[model samples]
Target: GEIQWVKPNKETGRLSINGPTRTKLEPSVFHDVFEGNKEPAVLHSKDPRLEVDFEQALFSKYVGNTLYEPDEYIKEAALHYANQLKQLEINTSQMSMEEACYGTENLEAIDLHTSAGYPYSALGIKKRDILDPTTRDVSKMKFYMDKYGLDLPYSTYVKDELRSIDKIKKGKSRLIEASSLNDSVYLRMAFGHLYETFHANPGTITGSAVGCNPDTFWSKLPILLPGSLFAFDYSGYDASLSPVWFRALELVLREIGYSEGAISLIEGINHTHHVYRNKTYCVLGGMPSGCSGTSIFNSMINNIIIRALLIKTFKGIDLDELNMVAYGDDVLASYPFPIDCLELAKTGKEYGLTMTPADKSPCFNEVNWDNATFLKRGFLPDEQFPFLIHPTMPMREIHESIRWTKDARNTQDHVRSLCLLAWHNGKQEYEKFVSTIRSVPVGRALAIPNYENLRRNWLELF
Candidate 1:
């Protein structure tokens, strides 16, 4: 079957399917396209109430954050790094530029059949239904941009308008380094050094790592039992809030000095779309996992609102004192006492967020720290010198990497999964490992040189 491209004409609320035939869906269903896909569509579902379930998940805007109570001990230690605090900057222009060039710099493209209502929607797309723009030599960059109805911010059409806006034209564009916000690394290093300092001086209590609801695979699971363990669930979070955040994102860009026209153009970048069968859905609320700038969008909003709320909530307390690191949707912090965890949860609820429950997040004092997980890594009590307290791969992720390695869909995926397995399993005899890898037909040829180098790189780089 030929891959079909569906486009929603701006304003009229009608849609076209690859040709002149135009059909108008009930406004909310199509409007779900812009609202971030929370609204139930009139699509046929395997279960009649499935759309409502999907809607519930999609509409949830608040979920998780880590917390740590105020403490004089950690606060005193936090002052030394104060100079680096103001360095966190959101360069909206640079963000727009990065997104503008996403297609050209990266060869990824939309899978036309990729579900707007995936997993919960229960429809699967075959490879034949995919039309990767790069493979066909079609400059379908607009194909990705236009579906959101907000044309590309860096599109030439917008660039011409930006030229007319003097404030933007005169504004110097500085590089927004992703290295500056080293999500896990920054937090790990901060905690590692702080804990190291505390070890020498005493009074610096070892803080707990509260694992909040990370919006990915692990967030959905509570536990993995030893033949006794688990199950799973989701409905797409924040589908209802997509429009609110989209508007909020626009206000943020504008406040940061982007012009009205630029902001309008850039707003579309935040708006994502979904496709199932022949219909196009303007995804309204939750972040799309498949989009290029999802990280930037998620990070920006966290910094914009979540961090600000935390700052006001804590009142002059530095994020480091709490050992708070807000990256993407995951939040982590250390608390002096268990009561602090209750207070942290209280604060999270006060500000439209949720925390990873007691079972999921390991409390340092109650549980043997060695068995717990933080930042997706399990604690290693035995290995001490280099990291003070090392965090290695957990059983859940270990099995996950192995699963991916064994059943990879593409050559790159095969190599990636193998590298992840090596990195997580750590210090394996690749000589024997290579033998097992070759059993998977796709891994046979690529496994040797490709997997070897990637394994070495993964080990050394991290």
Candidate 2:
């Protein structure tokens, strides 16, 4: 059905493309587009439901689709959850409902195409995702959230309630925090500052990416009291939870002038639920992956944890002197001296986190410099150059790494990583890398033009 367009605005004097008026109806289901189904069974199974299980089968020892039974470590962490909240000097008693809804106009607009999991096609078409943008008005959001059970339950305010957290099945049967469209808008609005706090900030490591291991799964790290009012049969123990990180978020939010109500509002939405296959399973712990705001929040919390732990371990340091770059969970930092990996591992356990082992989570000190190749792909520092951290990619290594694959995506990724790094070094090496990408006969036809366009875009960003 066609929607009516908004009237032209005369105030600006210049005419432009007019937008459609906001409608209450959700968008129609987008069928499996041709490009999405080229090799239907490769990326995912031909059977949609089967693909769901296949995706969930991927390992997540702590946070996934399964119901997790809290072991002693998790239970102990839970004991401190309320205490951590109390320690944050936020007083929610005076925060009114009106006050909680104050910043709707100031909030960033929701990405209408923000990927959502639901409304699948039964016609054997792959890539089941919804593309409906929801409301941003905080007052309307509060109403819709309560009606949808997407807001915090009354039990949320009760002290020491051992509730299991709720989750939802989004498109592709993936688990996301059960939240309304407005909740996403609110989160993005209120917590948008976090995006710049960790991501836009420059890296601190002055030399090689020694002693710097780009971490992963920082968003999946557990949050304190991360369950809904609903219950589920518990399964085997999972070893990770995020008390220290949750405390950091709470402190950061409080410091940023977020009221107790605002914090609770955010927490409540995260704890909402989705009922699947006639079974109601609450999210046991960890932040859900699908929210627009969760990643930014994750980076901020992860940086805080790393910064605080590093400062505590090495005294006589203030916040300004700390040198580190954190984008999501991928982190790299230069330290005063080479810190023991085991010490950090033990410290992480005390705070209810499981980290990569010393061997895999290498620190680039002189002794371990031999192990340093590139900071590994997916690390922001690896892509962005000269931000203090310089993970050496020798010209030889760049040539060796740039192998063309039959898969165009893989080939592109390979070239992009090396080309970005080469570009950072100087135009001389960059020109060499461009030639190298073109020489890969197997995939060069698809890669060269694509990467040149990519290179142009990256250049434009500068």
Candidate 3:
């Protein structure tokens, strides 16, 4: 639990802590949430859950649903057998008054949607996502599939194939620790497979920047689609559970008439877990952090179907022509039609639109709602992080050499093998790399082989 840093005195070559000796969250809490857990939810795919697993017997494993009035939903579900759902699961197995399950707000979403937030968090959704926009609150969400409706089922391909249970048994799956995508070998492996399989555009190697960074080929959207980047905060996404998420995606694939049944990437989190509403939840939220490959694939499916649905249902223009990408909830795309052709427009609400980058960068109505006072799209400071905030850093920089060397050690597939993956160069790159390197909690920060070589390589990578 301490965040320590050391640096050599410039003149004397003596090392010292650069700043304060910070502290992290308590270890007991970590243990209780992970190792000591005795509940229905276990084996998670969310990054924090995976991170927790890495620390304990948790999964190096690659491993939401919602909040509702406990009274209404509980009465709706409390009559099942105690064996219905595990006591630790998000689903209702122990929802009666005798057991204590409560309600909670979607704090994480609110934080990312409003606060200084996780750099990689999505600011919000595109217009097409919200089914209705009046009243400034959710009337309906375009992609929010219901858990036990046509969207979700009690049993799924993942559960059957993995012979799933409330908790992940050791022999059920292999585990690994990942500080980033590099350490998450399964992610990279599956991602590569996805590209090789899908027929969509596979351009550039600048990590998430392929969608937001100014350096990648996809950055040429303003020229390619000419005045098309449509975006917004919320209005889309109400969150989901794994079963519902899987069903939702399955339905999307069917809607697009592109049924490549059971692609591997979409199955990334079939083996992982998370916590919500004072309860541990496994397999929901449709999308979690560990599998970048799967998240992107699901995004591609959503984009294609959304455009098609808009066209067929509302007679909207070539929305199909609009190129887009989803970095978790964060989306960037180009729409060739007038600004008013958005989903909310169909609702007949009086419309007023404002945009800045609609012409210059053409990345209009920026949705980095990372903070309400900051990057609120139309009024963002021209100065923003040069790169898109990705849960995982770039993999190209990792190359085969870094992988081979890092693998040669007990780094345990350290996620930072590629250091900070951004467009920054030279001194900027070095500073970020060093700062990250020094932050290693497992020790040996100030010591390593070929430090200069790594820095120079980073300069070239960016």
Q: Point out the worst 10-residue segment of candidate 3 by lDDT.
A: 99-108
Q: Which lDDT value does model 2 have at 86?
A: 39
What TM-score, computed on C-alpha atoms, does each candidate reach?
0.45, 0.48, 0.33
- The TM-score obtained by model 3 is 0.33
Question: Candidate 2's error at 172, in angstroms?
Answer: 17
Residue 77 accuracy (lDDT) in model 1 = 29
List per-prediction Cα lDDT, in the order shown: 0.32, 0.36, 0.30
By TM-score, the best candidate is 2
Q: Give the total clashing residue pairs for model 1.
A: 15
lDDT of 1: 0.32
Per-residue lDDT over 1-462 for candidate 2, one digit per residue giving the tens place of the 0 to 100 score? 001122222432222222231222221111111011111121222333242443343223333222223333333333332233333333333322332333223233344343222111111212212221332234554554465443321110001111111211111223333233445534544444433232332233211122223232211111111221110111211213333345445655665466676566545433433332222333334554444455555544555655555444455544344344444444444444455555555555455555643233443233222332223432123244322223334554454334222343465565556565555444566665666444445435644433455445544443
RMSD of each: 16.8, 15.7, 22.3
TM-score of model number 1: 0.45
Model 2: residues with Cα > 4 Å off, grouped in runs: 1-60, 63-109, 116-149, 152-179, 193-239, 269-279, 290-292, 311-321, 357-462
lDDT of 2 at 209: 20
Best by lDDT: 2
